Amino acid sequence: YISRYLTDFEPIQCLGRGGFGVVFEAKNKVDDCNYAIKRIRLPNRELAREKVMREVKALAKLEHPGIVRYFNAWLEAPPKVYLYIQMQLCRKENLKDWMNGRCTIEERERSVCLHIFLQIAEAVEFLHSKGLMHRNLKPSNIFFTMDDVVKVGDFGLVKLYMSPEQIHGNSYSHKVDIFSLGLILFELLYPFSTQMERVRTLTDVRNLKFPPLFTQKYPCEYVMVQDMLSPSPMERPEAINIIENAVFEDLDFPGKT
Numbered sequence: 001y002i003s004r005y006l007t008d009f010e011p012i013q014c015l016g017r018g019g020f021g022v023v024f025e026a027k028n029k030v031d032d033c034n035y036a037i038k039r040i041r042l043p044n045r046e047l048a049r050e051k052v053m054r055e056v057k058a059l060a061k062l063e064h065p066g067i068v069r070y071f072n073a074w075l076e077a078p079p080k081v082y083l084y085i086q087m088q089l090c091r092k093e094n095l096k097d098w099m100n101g102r103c104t105i106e107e108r109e110r111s112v113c114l115h116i117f118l119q120i121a122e123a124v125e126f127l128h129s130k131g132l133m134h135r136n137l138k139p140s141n142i143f144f145t146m147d148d149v150v151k152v153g154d155f156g157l158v159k160l161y162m163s164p165e166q167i168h169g170n171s172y173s174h175k176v177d178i179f180s181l182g183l184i185l186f187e188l189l190y191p192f193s194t195q196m197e198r199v200r201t202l203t204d205v206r207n208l209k210f211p212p213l214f215t216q217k218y219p220c221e222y223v224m225v226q227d228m229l230s231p232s233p234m235e236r237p238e239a240i241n242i243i244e245n246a247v248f249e250d251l252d253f254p255g256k257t
């Protein structure tokens, strides 16, 4: 039996795993580039297989600077069944890691944080414009390219960020992603020293109880986070309304571009 993956790529390392999948870094022999390759063992569940196959088709149609670049997808059945998905290789350190390495307010300059957030919101806006919703938006699903371009996706390298309507298992709309955005904006601007402090504070912010020093330092951002975290989905602003906010006009910081 001839395996496409072993024939065409030289494996470099395991990048991680989660759910049905394992992710490898591997170099393509012909083009000499390194890629992130997800190997999905197709589940025994036909409806889960339906979702997997449908989602690769949807991904393949997407082109946006804030969405991880897609290259290829194929099936292999050795003598159970694997779906391989080949993507652009991003940096190892995601948004969660990036925030964890910047635990002082000096390391979270306003314009830098808003610049990162804007990119996330624009990626979310793109998805919504295509009739898609992320549903699982969180810092561990937000990576950076080698050039620090933020990439939103479904990484699966294994909750506080999901909307109330999702937690209760109710029906929902694209507005669920707006809730996640609110918590992320806050988290970007507000550095944590311990994991215990992070959980406590984000849980409070979920219920619209904000640290007093945040509300005073960032009055404009405080307002937009409140609106994004509205318990009622319909009261939450659209992604396009977020990105058009004056707060994002003419962002600049030393070293930008």
Ligand SMILES: CNc1ncc2cc(-c3c(C)ccc(C(=O)Nc4ccc(OC)c(C(F)(F)F)c4)c3N)ccc2n1
Binding pocket: 015, 023, 036, 037, 038, 055, 056, 058, 059, 062, 067, 068, 085, 086, 087, 088, 089, 090, 091, 092, 093, 127, 132, 133, 134, 143, 152, 153, 154, 155, 156, 157
């Ligand atoms: C550590 N470096 C690194 N770099 C790139 C990586 C790419 C992936 C990755 C792989 C290998 C395969 C698929 C994705 C992905 O984002 N999939 C995906 C599937 C469906 C979707 O909706 C149609 C989307 C969305 F972003 F459009 F929502 C995204 C994805 N993020 C995983 C780990 C990675 N790890």
